[PDB]
């Protein structure tokens, strides 16, 4: 055939892949964690958005730390050979590097390690997307008014390659959620995927999500500590190719 290029992930497998949504709203009383009002709005928005991108969406509500790990383990052990990609959305309380089950914390690294290139072989070389709506700390953004190492005989890739983490907020910062409308980040992500998934490469979609969250939202609080604060999401990419949700017919 003619000249061929390899700059984008193959996204025309028979299935787009799973989209697992872990929606933690209600926490055990002994954790002292508050109910996450609005998170069902996010969960529904995501289900609809990824449905229209032709993902197999599986929603899970109110999972313990043990259940989160068992779920991820089981999903990583499925045969994904006929799937283009994998998406996991985590909606919960969090701190830096940590997401909360209903009864206590899970290291994000424990969850994503199940999908490493050497541990989930049917996803090796395919994009693995983790979308994380959770705090990463307690900082508040006040805002501002505006030849040994070459040509190896056996080709390997890094086990950490082909992950993308779309974090709702910068490292160290709170993440904001409206009780009625859902989280700023998930609202914006769904809106931008609806508008641009058939038009733009994913990193460029997420850049528009960054701009929308950064410019269109500001907190309002009767507590001066928490009033008039801003948020910027944080894209963390170890992808090795461009990612388009569409393909040529």
């Amino acid at each position: 055939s003619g000249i061929s290029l390899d700059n984008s992930y193959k996204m025309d497998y028979p299935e787009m892949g799973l989209c697992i949504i872990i929606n933690n709203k209600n926490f055990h009383k002994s954790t002292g964690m508050t109910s996450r009002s609005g998170t069902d709005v996010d969960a529904a928005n995501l289900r609809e958005t990824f449905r229209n991108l032709k993902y197999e969406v599986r929603n899970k509500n109110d999972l313990t730390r043990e259940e989160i790990v068992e779920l991820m383990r089981d999903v990583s052990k499925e045969d994904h050979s006929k799937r283009s990609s994998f998406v996991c959305v985590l909606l919960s309380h969090g701190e830096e590097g940590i997401i909360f089950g209903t009864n206590g914390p899970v290291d994000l690294k424990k969850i994503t390690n199940f999908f490493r290139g050497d541990r989930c072989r049917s996803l090796t070389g395919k994009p693995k997307l983790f979308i994380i709506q959770a705090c990463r700390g307690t900082e508040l953004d006040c805002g501002i008014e505006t030849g040994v190492d070459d040509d190896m005989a056996c080709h390997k890739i890094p086990v950490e390659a082909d992950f993308l983490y779309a974090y709702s907020t910068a490292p160290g910062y709170y993440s904001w959620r409206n009780s009625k409308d859902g989280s700023w980040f998930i609202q914006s992500l769904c809106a931008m995927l609806k508008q641009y998934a058939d038009k733009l490469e994913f990193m460029h979609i997420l850049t528009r999500v960054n701009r929308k969250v950064a410019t269109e939202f500001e907190s309002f609080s009767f507590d001066a500590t928490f009033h008039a604060k801003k948020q910027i999401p944080c894209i963390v990419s170890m992808l090795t190719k461009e990612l388009y949700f569409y393909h040529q017919l």
């Binding site: 508050t34 996450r36 309380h93 969090g94 705090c135 709170y174 904001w176 959620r177 928490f226």
Partner: peptide, 4 residues
């Protein structure tokens, strides 16, 4: 408005 709440934080996560």
């Amino acid at each position: 408005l709440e934080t996560d």
